[PDB]
């Protein structure tokens, strides 16, 4: 989103893990990275040198109709014919792929397999069984346009790139196609490494929130301080907007007091602090210094500011936690009576 | 050993037993809808054997979502549907008054008066009640056009529940919904040109309504318009993959490799239809997909190209934008034109959405209705679907008529003025008309005796009593304020109800009661083991 | 007690017990292959409990062979035959 | 289908037979098996 | 999910469930070592001496105990006669080699140990070496004949057995060409051996009994293909448009049927063996050439008439030369009573051999071949590898005494492991004295002064 | 016959007239192949009986259905080309002796009871195999874990 401002963004960053090595081993690629492996020697690889990459589409086996196909056989000449015409059309449609010059293909299903043999002499790194919806990722990223049908596979959507990589180094010996790098712009993507499977699925998980966390900036620039400091700040604030409240909101505002103590409060119990000393220091603090940097930081096992040790979080984060908690609450509290049937 | 049959594993309930097991059950589907009326009133969170959760207020959704065994009860379940169908709300004062009428049935038979001399009764002072509540009119088929206060009034007929505390958007978002599809519900055009997107966000407040069908489709390659610029558009309906003539045909190549010739052809057949479409006038939109070539033709020939549009949308499509569903492109375009309004496609929520900025003739329109959780969109689906059916049909029907008890006691106190005439024609039929009044007497009270608890106002005793004394002389007027708890007019306050409501809400409950009280005996097939478990 | 979710079949242990059922999960998959490294070390036989034997001083295949109840355990066993894919050999002492 | 060996000569109820060299190989092991028990128990510097 | 023994504690049950294998072959060695009646499921029964059967239909529980069962036929393969020896020392092995376990430092220590003592007793071994001609291997084989149920004719199977090695005739001799059919009945004298192949093949020609009962001279052909009305291998369907095009089709079939024979009597056929069976049509337009043919003959044995006759098995008569015929001297199919059997000698040069045997019941049979394989294989043997050992448990005890000597002249805290090693091949030997005694301890330090 | 394509004869009488025509096809390739050297044929699908007779009269060693993961590494070494399709550009049959490889001996061994076609010497010198050889299959395995946790 960078040069366009601030939006509404959706992830179109990939992240694949492969189960082998650790934490820091993964690392971001210039470029774009593929699950599917090579054709193997099915056939015959990687990387053609300079590449040219194609977004190949449809069908590849020999030339069958949609409709009903049956080449009935009356004569006895014909299965020459038949058996040499079918090495024409499945031939011709591989010439063509190289005479545009794209280096590579990618097909998802129905691809033949006599006709990877006149594809071994090409050196082309034929790749099957690509994500079918993907084809609007890829896409954008190798700068490579889809191509449809047979005929049109023109020199023009040709993936303008130079290397193609299929590394199996290093445990686990399960290797991955990287592609760097391509002329076009505004596709990232990254590949991340742990052992057990278990940190992949959370090193993964560590960045969907690191990487919304970026998005709440962009979505709504603004960021407060943790450590509960946020928190802080209503128990003084809101309670004052209380006591000029008079009636019954007096009390239930008060609440409001009673309830955004616990985010300081477990986050210092977490760490073995007294719930009752930080937080009693932090009324302190808040009430002396507008609560504007203060609060509890676990490395400084203390109540520092936030801000000053860089403690920071984005404006929504913890407004648009607060709206649910409320708007759940009301749900929940608009609940009587409980009974049970079949929906 | 007798058999004496009849037969095993059935039994007959008879007589009086009957009339206990059909009485007697009535109004339990009465404890169960009590919460549901007054704005002060609560919700309810029902359970299933497929482990999950609903927690709304709606009637229909307490009853039909039920499970029960006593005919009487299934059978006010089926009248509370009834309702639900035919107009938005009143579901649930059909039952409430439905078994407070036939409570106050099982109660005359301490006086030992016949059944069909309660139902003789009872139709007397039904009719008679309707008949008052007819003669109140203040309908506004006229100008003033605006009738804003109707539209408030539907708001008045959602309030409670969770959506009415928030406002007061709604009938806004509502009212302005359907005054769009409003000329298409008089057509017999269903509420289905209104569609409902849940993009859970911020809460139930933020959610709004934005002018321009919403859609979340594609755009589905990326060599693509990423948005359409005043653009025409296209609803369509032909066939994109299965690609065959509609014809029993079997291409039999009896060469060697014809089908080359053959499996090209078809492959080219799909590019002639597809250049009509190039041919004029710009954007693509069709229910049945399109295969990956033919979508990829368009991607290239510059046309927006929108595949899977279900069958409510490209009816919804036509409604928006003002296009003709119209496939065959072998004559275009005679009486075929699809007029646009930008088309920019936003994300919202972290979901794709494509939505047209511009457009013209709305006659249907989708409305985002963001939350906090999807138990609560469930329900807020629900609310907007009641009162978003009330006022639909009260834009058929333009009677209007005062909400808060003010409708119901004008019903009761005509009722019971006739009714005190009752006796006299003639004596004891005289009790079951003045009794159906008290039914719809103890529908307020059951409104905010056992329902309006809070702000605390709750009296049975008081707050009714204020509007029989205080509401003979208001004839329609002096309804309740059970926010406040005093007897205020509605009509200075905006509680404006729909005639066709609240008069179906006796009409059900009366022919209901009668077909009850018909019943002498009731008979069962035992079908599962047991099962008393 | 609870009333928390969700039994029957569904549970969960807590701080202590579980830093503990841990640990001793690792120290089982681990103290039977304790054994195996080092010149001094020996080779074992695991039964198909259909009679058939497997003799083996690898640790990598014997943990395999084992079975590995449990998620601390099968841990290991994972971590196992991480080692022959960066190596080939230390699988015994590397757990 | 068969098959089965016969008993050779038959007796009360069951009985247990020792052929003397298979006993002694047998049963010197049987001794054997509370020796290796009651050698770490003999002595001071032991085990209990 | 289930306990492990450990340490020790199960170290043990290891070895005395080692010797516990051993213990069940002390009886067969080869002096009087009586046979083994051992039943068997399904309801297989049989009875000998053989280590790799008789343990090999015996099934056994434990580890130590199943890898013992294994080096019987581990070993059998390997040369074929050391059965009931490799088991038997095996065992006695460990035996002589427990005490030093837990009284010796560790289990590691004797395995260095034992490398000194392979090493050494394969030299000693190598030491007590005779050289084998290549009449006198009838020396030899004469050994491998004398343990079993072959002593009685001790004579006629060494020469049956170093004959059928005779014919193939290869250096290095497959006994896949060498079958052994086992009549019932007769005398066990009577076990000639054919320089050709008996089939259980009955009249052939089933269509009639014309063809030659045996003829002289014969000229054979051996067939993998059909020989009858061959279906389109590409699944064809037919389609009569025709009113009279159903003759013309039934022709065609009766048609390839003899044009199938015509090309393949063009090779002065006499006989063809043809593995499959013969349609009855192509059974009569070659049968008018006086040619005999035998069909359903197994795949290995058209193997065995390949060498034999000298013809080459080929496929689709269309392609057939004159180096596919053969030259065989006679073929007659004697009844051995109420059953046929078509018998197929001669040719010069030809390396099949089929030994038919001949004595009592089929399971006495069996154990004659079952011993006489160990005759057969105890010569290639000597003949692969053209160079003998002193027998009789003699090179036994003298890579004892041997090892024994080097034990004094080692420096080490291992060297109680040579000695086990030793100590335990003394016992190759002992049985011999103990299945003949009593008693065989006395004789024992007699060869000791003698080596 | 490819699937798909069926055979609907008529008004032949010519059923047999391509019956052959199915086998030669095959055979053609064969020779076409034999042609070129056809010392040694290694195939990984197999060879069939009527179609060995013919690598047997030219005493060509031919062996049915080997492993893919083996006629790679061996061609690897030989110089040669392991052939997928015979078709090599258009038109062609067809092969090419400089297709095949290039080795001293593919003698065929024995080990007890068992034998193995072993390929001494090659174009490229980077062969090697290990045939270990102990008491028991309990042992001669576990010898192999030792070896493929060494030669790591
Ligand atoms: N704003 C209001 N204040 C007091 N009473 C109201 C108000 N709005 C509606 N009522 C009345 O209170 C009752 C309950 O609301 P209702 O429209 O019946 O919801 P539902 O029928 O779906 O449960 C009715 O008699 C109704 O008309
Ligand atoms: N009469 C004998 N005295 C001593 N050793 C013999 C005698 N006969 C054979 N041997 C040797 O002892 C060997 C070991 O026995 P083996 O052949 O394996 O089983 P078995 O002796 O029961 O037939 C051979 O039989 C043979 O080489
Ligand atoms: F029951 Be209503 F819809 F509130
Ligand atoms: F078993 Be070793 F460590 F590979
Ligand atoms: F067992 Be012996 F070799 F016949």
């Given at each position: 989103?960078?040069?366009?401002?601030?939006?509404?963004?959706?992830?179109?960053?990939?992240?694949?893990?492969?189960?082998?090595?650790?934490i820091?081993?993964?690392?971001?690629?210039?470029?774009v990275?593929?699950?599917?492996?090579?054709s193997?020697?099915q056939?015959?690889?990687?990387?053609?040198?300079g590449?040219?990459?194609a977004?190949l589409?449809?069908?590849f086996?020999?030339?069958?109709?949609?409709?009903?196909?049956?080449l009935?056989?009356s004569?006895?000449?014909?299965?020459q014919?038949?058996?040499?015409?079918?090495?024409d059309k499945?031939?011709?449609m591989?010439?063509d792929?190289?005479?545009?010059?794209?280096?590579?293909?990618?097909?998802?299903w129905?691809?033949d397999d006599e006709?990877?043999?006149?594809?071994?002499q090409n050196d082309?790194?034929?790749?099957?069984w690509?994500?079918?919806?993907e084809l609007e990722?890829?896409a954008?990223?190798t700068?490579?346009?889809?191509?449809?049908r047979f005929?049109?596979?023109?020199?023009?959507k040709?993936?303008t790139?130079?290397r193609?990589?299929?590394?199996?180094f290093?445990?686990?010996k399960d290797?991955?196609?990287?592609?760097?790098?391509?002329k076009?712009?505004?596709?990232?993507?990254?590949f991340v490494?742990?052992?057990?499977?278990?940190?992949?699925?959370?090193?993964e998980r560590?960045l969907?929130?690191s990487?919304?966390?970026?998005?709440?900036?962009?979505?709504?620039?603004?960021?407060?301080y943790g450590?509960?400091?946020?928190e802080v700040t209503?128990?003084?604030?809101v309670?004052?907007?209380?006591?000029?409240?008079?009636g019954?909101d007096?009390?239930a505002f008060?609440?409001?007091?009673?309830?955004?103590?616990?985010?300081?409060?477990?986050?210092?119990e977490?760490?073995?602090?007294d719930?009752?000393?930080?937080l009693?220091?932090?009324?302190?603090?808040?009430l002396?210094?507008?609560?504007?940097?203060?609060?509890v930081?676990?490395?400084?096992?203390?109540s520092?500011?936030?801000?000053?040790?860089?403690?920071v979080?984005?404006?929504?984060?913890?407004?648009?936690?607060?709206?649910?908690?409320?708007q759940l609450?009301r749900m929940?509290?608009?609940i009587?009576?409980?009974?049970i049937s079949?929906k | 050993?007798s058999?004496q049959?009849?037969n095993?594993?059935?039994?007959?309930?008879r007589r009086?037993?009957?009339?206990?097991?059909?009485?007697?059950?009535?109004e339990?589907?009465?404890?169960?809808?009590?919460?549901?009326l007054?704005?002060?009133?609560?919700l309810?969170?029902?359970?299933?054997?497929?482990?999950?959760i609903?927690?709304?207020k709606?009637?229909?959704?307490?009853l039909?979502?039920?499970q029960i065994?006593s005919?009487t009860?299934?059978?006010?379940?089926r009248a509370?549907?009834?309702?639900?169908?035919?107009?938005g709300?009143?579901?649930?004062?059909v039952?409430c008054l439905?078994?407070?009428?036939?409570?106050?049935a099982?109660?005359?038979?301490?006086?030992?008066?016949h059944?069909?001399?309660?139902?003789?009764?009872?139709?007397?002072?039904?009719?008679?009640?309707?008949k008052?509540?007819d003669?109140?009119?203040?309908?506004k088929?006229?100008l003033?056009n605006?009738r804003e206060?109707?539209?408030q009034?539907a708001?008045?007929?959602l309030?409670?529940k969770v959506?009415?505390?928030?406002?007061?958007?709604?009938?806004?978002?509502v009212?302005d919904?359907?005054l769009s599809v409003?000329?298409?519900?008089?057509?017999?055009l269903?509420?289905?040109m209104?569609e409902?997107?849940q993009?859970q966000?911020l809460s139930?407040?933020?959610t709004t309504?934005?002018?321009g069908?919403v859609?979340?489709?594609?755009?589905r390659?990326?060599?693509?318009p990423?948005?359409?610029k005043?653009?025409?558009?296209?609803?369509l309906?032909?066939?994109?993959?299965?690609?065959?003539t509609?014809?029993?045909s079997?291409?039999?190549?009896s060469?060697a490799?014809?089908?080359?010739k053959?499996?090209a052809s078809?492959?080219?057949?799909?590019?002639?239809?597809?250049?009509?479409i190039?041919?004029?006038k710009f954007?693509?939109?069709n229910?049945?997909g399109?295969?990956?070539?033919?979508?990829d033709?368009?991607?290239?020939?510059?046309?927006?190209?929108?595949?899977?549009?279900?069958?409510?949308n490209?009816?919804?499509?036509?409604?928006?934008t003002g296009?003709e569903?119209?496939?065959?492109?072998?004559?275009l375009?005679p009486?075929?034109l699809?007029?646009?309004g930008?088309?920019y496609?936003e994300?919202?929520?972290?979901?794709?959405?494509?939505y047209?900025?511009?457009?013209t003739?709305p006659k249907?329109?989708?409305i985002?209705?963001?939350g906090?959780?999807?138990?609560?969109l469930?329900?807020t689906?629900?609310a907007?679907?009641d009162?978003?059916?009330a006022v639909?049909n009260?834009?058929?029907?333009?009677?209007?008529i005062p909400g808060?008890?003010?409708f119901?006691i004008?019903?009761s106190?005509?009722?019971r003025?006739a009714n005190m005439?009752?006796?006299?024609?003639?004596?004891?039929t005289?009790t079951?008309?003045?009794?159906?009044?008290?039914?719809?007497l103890?529908?307020?009270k059951?409104?905010?005796?056992?329902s309006?608890?809070d702000?605390?106002?709750?009296?049975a005793?008081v707050?009714d009593?204020?509007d029989?004394a205080?509401?003979?002389?208001?004839?329609?007027?002096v309804?309740?304020?059970?926010?406040?708890?005093?007897?205020?007019d509605?009509?200075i306050?905006?509680?404006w109800?729909?005639?066709?409501?609240?008069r179906?809400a006796?009409?059900?409950?009366?022919?209901?009661?009668?077909?009850?009280?018909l019943?002498?005996?009731?008979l069962?097939?035992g079908?599962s083991?047991?099962?008393?478990? | 007690?609870?009333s928390?979710?969700?039994?029957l079949?569904?549970?969960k242990?807590?701080?202590?017990?579980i830093?503990?059922?841990?640990?001793?999960?690792?120290?089982?998959?681990?103290?039977?292959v304790?054994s195996?490294?080092?010149p001094?070390?020996?080779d074992?036989?695991?039964?198909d409990?259909?009679?058939?034997?497997?003799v083996?001083?690898?640790g990598?295949?014997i943990?395999?062979?084992?079975?590995?109840?449990?998620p601390?355990?099968?841990?290991?066993?994972?971590?196992?035959?991480?080692?022959?894919?960066?190596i080939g050999d230390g699988?015994?002492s590397?757990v | 289908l068969?098959?089965?060996?016969?008993?050779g000569?038959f007796?009360?109820?069951?009985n247990?037979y020792?052929n003397?060299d298979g006993?002694?190989?047998?049963?010197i092991?049987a001794?054997?098996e509370l020796?290796?028990?009651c050698?770490?128990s003999?002595?001071?510097?032991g085990?209990? | 999910?289930?306990?492990?023994?450990?340490?020790?504690?199960?170290?043990?049950?290891n070895?005395?469930?080692?010797?516990?294998?051993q213990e069940a072959?002390?009886?067969?060695?080869?002096?009087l070592?009586s046979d083994?009646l051992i039943?068997?499921?399904?309801?297989?029964?049989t009875?000998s001496?053989?280590?790799?059967?008789?343990?090999?239909?015996?099934d056994?529980?434990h580890?130590a105990?199943?890898?013992?069962?294994?080096?019987?036929?581990a070993?059998?393969?390997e040369v074929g006669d050391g059965?009931?020896?490799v088991?038997?020392l095996?065992?006695?092995?460990?035996?002589?080699?427990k005490?030093?376990?837990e009284?010796g430092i560790?289990?590691?220590?004797?395995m260095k140990?034992?490398?000194?003592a392979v090493?050494?007793?394969?030299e000693?071994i190598?030491?007590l070496?005779?050289?084998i001609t290549?009449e006198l291997?009838?020396?030899?084989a004469?050994?491998?004949?004398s343990?079993?149920?072959?002593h009685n004719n001790?004579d006629?199977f060494?020469?049956?057995?170093?004959?059928?090695?005779?014919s193939?005739?290869?250096?290095?001799?497959d006994?896949?060409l060498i079958g052994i059919?086992?009549?019932?009945?007769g005398?066990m004298?009577?076990?000639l051996?054919?320089?050709?192949?008996?089939?259980?093949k009955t009249?052939?020609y089933?269509?009639?009994?014309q063809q030659?009962?045996?003829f002289?001279?014969?000229k054979?052909?051996?067939?993998?293909?059909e020989?009858?009305l061959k279906?389109?291998?590409?699944?064809?369907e037919?389609?009569?448009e025709?009113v009279?095009?159903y003759?013309?089709?039934?022709?065609?079939?009766w048609?390839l049927?003899?044009e199938?024979?015509?090309?393949?009597?063009?090779?002065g056929?006499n006989?063809?063996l043809?593995?499959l069976?013969?349609?009855?049509?192509?059974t009569?337009?070659?049968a008018?050439r006086?040619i005999?043919?035998?069909?359903?003959?197994?795949?290995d044995?058209?193997?065995?008439?390949?060498?034999?006759?000298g013809?080459?098995?080929q496929?689709?008569?269309?392609?057939?030369?004159?180096?596919?015929?053969?030259?065989?001297?006679?073929?007659?199919?004697?009844?051995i009573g109420?059953e046929?059997?078509?018998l197929?000698?001669?040719?010069?040069q030809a390396?099949?051999?089929?030994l038919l045997?001949?004595?009592?019941?089929?399971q006495?049979?069996?154990?004659?071949e079952?011993?006489?394989?160990?005759?057969?294989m105890?010569?290639?043997?000597?003949?692969q590898?053209?160079?003998?050992?002193?027998?009789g448990?003699a090179?036994?005890?003298?890579?004892?005494?041997?090892?024994r000597?080097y034990?004094?002249?080692?420096?080490?805290?291992?060297?109680?492991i040579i000695?086990?090693?030793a100590?335990a091949?003394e016992?190759?030997?002992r049985?011999?004295?103990e299945?003949?005694?009593?008693?065989?301890?006395?004789?024992?330090?007699?060869?000791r002064?003698?080596? | 016959?490819?699937?798909?394509?069926?055979?609907?004869?008529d008004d032949?009488?010519?059923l047999?007239?391509?019956r052959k025509?199915?086998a030669?096809?095959?055979?053609?390739?064969?020779?076409?192949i034999?042609?070129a050297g056809?010392?040694?044929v290694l195939?990984?699908?197999?060879?069939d009986?009527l179609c060995?007779?013919?690598?047997?009269?030219?005493?060509?060693?031919?062996?049915?259905?080997?492993?893919?993961e083996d006629?790679?590494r061996?061609?690897?070494?030989?110089?040669?080309?392991?052939?997928s399709?015979?078709?090599?550009?258009?038109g062609?049959?067809?092969?090419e002796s400089?297709y095949?490889?290039?080795?001293d001996?593919?003698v065929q061994?024995?080990?007890?009871?068992d034998?193995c076609?072993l390929i001494?010497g090659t174009?490229k010198?980077?062969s090697?195999?290990?045939?270990?050889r102990?008491?028991?299959?309990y042992?001669?395995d576990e010898?192999?874990?030792?070896?493929?946790?060494?030669?790591?």
């Amino acid at each position: 989103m960078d040069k366009d401002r601030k939006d509404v963004d959706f992830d179109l960053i990939k992240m694949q893990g492969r189960v082998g090595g650790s934490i820091s081993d993964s690392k971001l690629i210039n470029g774009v990275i593929l699950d599917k492996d090579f054709s193997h020697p099915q056939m015959p690889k990687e990387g053609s040198d300079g590449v040219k990459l194609a977004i190949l589409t449809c069908p590849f086996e020999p030339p069958k109709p949609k409709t009903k196909h049956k080449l009935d056989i009356s004569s006895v000449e014909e299965y020459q014919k038949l058996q040499t015409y079918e090495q024409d059309k499945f031939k011709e449609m591989i010439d063509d792929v190289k005479k545009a010059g794209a280096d590579v293909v990618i097909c998802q299903w129905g691809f033949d397999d006599e006709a990877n043999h006149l594809l071994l002499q090409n050196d082309l790194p034929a790749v099957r069984w690509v994500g079918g919806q993907e084809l609007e990722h890829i896409a954008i990223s190798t700068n490579g346009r889809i191509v449809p049908r047979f005929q049109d596979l023109s020199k023009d959507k040709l993936g303008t790139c130079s290397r193609i990589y299929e590394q199996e180094f290093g445990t686990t010996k399960d290797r991955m196609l990287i592609i760097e790098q391509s002329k076009e712009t505004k596709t990232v993507t990254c590949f991340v490494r742990g052992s057990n499977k278990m940190i992949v699925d959370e090193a993964e998980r560590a960045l969907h929130d690191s990487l919304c966390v970026v998005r709440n900036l962009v979505k709504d620039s603004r960021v407060v301080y943790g450590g509960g400091a946020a928190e802080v700040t209503m128990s003084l604030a809101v309670s004052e907007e209380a006591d000029k409240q008079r009636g019954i909101d007096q009390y239930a505002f008060r609440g409001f007091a009673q309830a955004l103590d616990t985010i300081p409060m477990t986050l210092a119990e977490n760490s073995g602090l007294d719930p009752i000393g930080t937080l009693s220091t932090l009324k302190s603090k808040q009430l002396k210094e507008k609560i504007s940097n203060i609060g509890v930081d676990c490395l400084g096992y203390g109540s520092n500011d936030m801000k000053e040790l860089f403690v920071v979080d984005p404006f929504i984060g913890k407004k648009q936690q607060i709206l649910l908690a409320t708007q759940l609450c009301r749900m929940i509290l608009k609940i009587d009576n409980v009974i049970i049937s079949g929906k | 050993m007798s058999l004496q049959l009849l037969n095993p594993k059935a039994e007959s309930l008879r007589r009086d037993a009957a009339l206990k097991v059909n009485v007697t059950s009535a109004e339990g589907l009465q404890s169960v809808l009590e919460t549901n009326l007054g704005p002060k009133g609560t919700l309810k969170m029902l359970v299933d054997g497929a482990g999950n959760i609903k927690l709304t207020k709606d009637g229909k959704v307490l009853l039909t979502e039920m499970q029960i065994q006593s005919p009487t009860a299934v059978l006010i379940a089926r009248a509370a549907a009834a309702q639900d169908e035919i107009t938005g709300d009143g579901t649930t004062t059909v039952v409430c008054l439905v078994g407070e009428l036939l409570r106050q049935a099982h109660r005359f038979i301490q006086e030992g008066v016949h059944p069909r001399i309660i139902t003789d009764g009872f139709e007397i002072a039904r009719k008679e009640s309707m008949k008052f509540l007819d003669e109140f009119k203040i309908s506004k088929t006229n100008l003033s056009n605006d009738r804003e206060f109707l539209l408030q009034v539907a708001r008045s007929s959602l309030l409670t529940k969770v959506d009415a505390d928030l406002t007061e958007v709604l009938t806004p978002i509502v009212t302005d919904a359907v005054l769009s599809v409003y000329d298409a519900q008089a057509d017999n055009l269903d509420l289905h040109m209104v569609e409902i997107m849940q993009m859970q966000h911020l809460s139930p407040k933020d959610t709004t309504f934005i002018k321009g069908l919403v859609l979340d489709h594609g755009g589905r390659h990326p060599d693509m318009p990423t948005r359409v610029k005043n653009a025409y558009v296209l609803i369509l309906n032909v066939s994109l993959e299965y690609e065959k003539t509609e014809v029993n045909s079997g291409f039999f190549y009896s060469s060697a490799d014809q089908r080359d010739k053959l499996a090209a052809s078809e492959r080219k057949f799909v590019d002639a239809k597809l250049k009509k479409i190039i041919d004029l006038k710009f954007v693509i939109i069709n229910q049945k997909g399109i295969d990956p070539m033919s979508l990829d033709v368009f991607a290239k020939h510059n046309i927006l190209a929108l595949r899977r549009a279900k069958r409510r949308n490209m009816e919804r499509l036509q409604l928006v934008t003002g296009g003709e569903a119209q496939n065959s492109v072998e004559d275009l375009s005679p009486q075929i034109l699809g007029f646009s309004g930008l088309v920019y496609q936003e994300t919202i929520g972290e979901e794709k959405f494509t939505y047209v900025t511009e457009n013209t003739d709305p006659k249907s329109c989708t409305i985002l209705i963001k939350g906090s959780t999807h138990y609560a969109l469930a329900q807020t689906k629900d609310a907007v679907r009641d009162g978003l059916r009330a006022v639909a049909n009260v834009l058929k029907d333009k009677n209007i008529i005062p909400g808060a008890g003010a409708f119901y006691i004008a019903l009761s106190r005509y009722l019971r003025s006739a009714n005190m005439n009752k006796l006299g024609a003639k004596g004891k039929t005289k009790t079951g008309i003045e009794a159906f009044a008290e039914a719809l007497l103890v529908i307020p009270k059951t409104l905010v005796k056992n329902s309006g608890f809070d702000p605390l106002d709750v009296l049975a005793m008081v707050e009714d009593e204020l509007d029989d004394a205080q509401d003979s002389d208001e004839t329609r007027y002096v309804g309740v304020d059970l926010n406040i708890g005093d007897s205020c007019d509605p009509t200075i306050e905006g509680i404006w109800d729909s005639y066709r409501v609240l008069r179906n809400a006796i009409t059900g409950a009366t022919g209901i009661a009668s077909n009850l009280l018909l019943c002498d005996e009731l008979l069962r097939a035992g079908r599962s083991t047991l099962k008393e478990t | 007690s609870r009333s928390d979710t969700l039994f029957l079949g569904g549970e969960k242990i807590s701080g202590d017990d579980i830093r503990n059922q841990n640990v001793l999960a690792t120290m089982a998959v681990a103290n039977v292959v304790k054994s195996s490294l080092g010149p001094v070390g020996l080779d074992k036989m695991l039964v198909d409990d259909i009679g058939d034997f497997t003799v083996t001083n690898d640790g990598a295949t014997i943990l395999s062979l084992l079975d590995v109840q449990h998620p601390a355990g099968k841990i290991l066993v994972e971590l196992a035959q991480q080692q022959d894919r960066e190596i080939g050999d230390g699988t015994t002492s590397v757990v | 289908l068969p098959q089965n060996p016969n008993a050779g000569l038959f007796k009360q109820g069951y009985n247990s037979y020792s052929n003397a060299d298979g006993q002694i190989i047998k049963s010197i092991a049987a001794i054997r098996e509370l020796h290796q028990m009651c050698l770490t128990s003999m002595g001071p510097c032991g085990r209990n | 999910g289930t306990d492990a023994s450990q340490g020790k504690g199960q170290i043990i049950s290891n070895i005395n469930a080692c010797v516990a294998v051993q213990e069940a072959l002390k009886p067969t060695l080869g002096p009087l070592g009586s046979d083994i009646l051992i039943v068997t499921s399904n309801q297989k029964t049989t009875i000998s001496n053989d280590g790799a059967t008789i343990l090999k239909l015996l099934d056994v529980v434990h580890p130590a105990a199943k890898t013992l069962v294994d080096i019987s036929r581990a070993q059998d393969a390997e040369v074929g006669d050391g059965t009931t020896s490799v088991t038997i020392l095996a065992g006695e092995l460990m035996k002589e080699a427990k005490p030093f376990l837990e009284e010796g430092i560790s289990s590691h220590l004797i395995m260095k140990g034992y490398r000194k003592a392979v090493s050494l007793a394969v030299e000693k071994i190598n030491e007590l070496a005779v050289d084998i001609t290549s009449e006198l291997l009838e020396r030899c084989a004469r050994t491998a004949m004398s343990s079993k149920l072959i002593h009685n004719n001790a004579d006629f199977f060494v020469k049956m057995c170093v004959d059928a090695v005779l014919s193939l005739d290869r250096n290095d001799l497959d006994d896949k060409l060498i079958g052994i059919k086992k009549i019932p009945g007769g005398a066990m004298e009577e076990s000639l051996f054919i320089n050709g192949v008996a089939f259980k093949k009955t009249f052939s020609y089933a269509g009639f009994e014309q063809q030659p009962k045996k003829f002289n001279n014969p000229k054979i052909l051996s067939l993998n293909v059909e020989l009858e009305l061959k279906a389109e291998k590409d699944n064809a369907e037919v389609r009569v448009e025709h009113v009279e095009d159903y003759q013309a089709i039934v022709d065609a079939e009766w048609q390839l049927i003899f044009e199938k024979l015509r090309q393949v009597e063009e090779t002065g056929a006499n006989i063809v063996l043809s593995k499959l069976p013969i349609g009855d049509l192509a059974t009569q337009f070659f049968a008018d050439r006086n040619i005999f043919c035998a069909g359903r003959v197994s795949a290995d044995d058209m193997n065995r008439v390949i060498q034999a006759v000298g013809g080459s098995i080929q496929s689709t008569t269309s392609d057939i030369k004159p180096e596919h015929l053969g030259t065989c001297a006679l073929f007659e199919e004697m009844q051995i009573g109420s059953e046929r059997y078509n018998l197929f000698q001669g040719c010069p040069q030809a390396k099949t051999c089929t030994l038919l045997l001949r004595g009592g019941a089929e399971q006495v049979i069996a154990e004659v071949e079952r011993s006489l394989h160990d005759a057969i294989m105890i010569v290639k043997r000597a003949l692969q590898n053209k160079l003998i050992v002193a027998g009789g448990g003699a090179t036994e005890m003298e890579v004892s005494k041997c090892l024994r000597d080097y034990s004094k002249t080692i420096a080490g805290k291992q060297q109680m492991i040579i000695n086990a090693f030793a100590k335990a091949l003394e016992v190759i030997p002992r049985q011999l004295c103990e299945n003949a005694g009593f008693d065989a301890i006395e004789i024992l330090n007699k060869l000791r002064l003698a080596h | 016959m490819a699937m798909g394509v069926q055979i609907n004869i008529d008004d032949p009488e010519q059923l047999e007239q391509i019956r052959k025509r199915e086998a030669g096809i095959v055979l053609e390739r064969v020779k076409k192949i034999i042609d070129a050297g056809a010392q040694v044929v290694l195939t990984t699908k197999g060879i069939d009986d009527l179609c060995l007779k013919e690598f047997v009269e030219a005493k060509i060693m031919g062996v049915r259905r080997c492993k893919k993961e083996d006629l790679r590494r061996i061609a690897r070494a030989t110089g040669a080309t392991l052939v997928s399709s015979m078709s090599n550009l258009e038109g062609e049959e067809t092969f090419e002796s400089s297709y095949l490889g290039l080795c001293d001996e593919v003698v065929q061994a024995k080990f007890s009871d068992d034998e193995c076609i072993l390929i001494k010497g090659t174009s490229k010198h980077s062969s090697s195999s290990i045939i270990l050889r102990g008491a028991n299959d309990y042992s001669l395995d576990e010898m192999e874990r030792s070896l493929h946790d060494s030669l790591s």
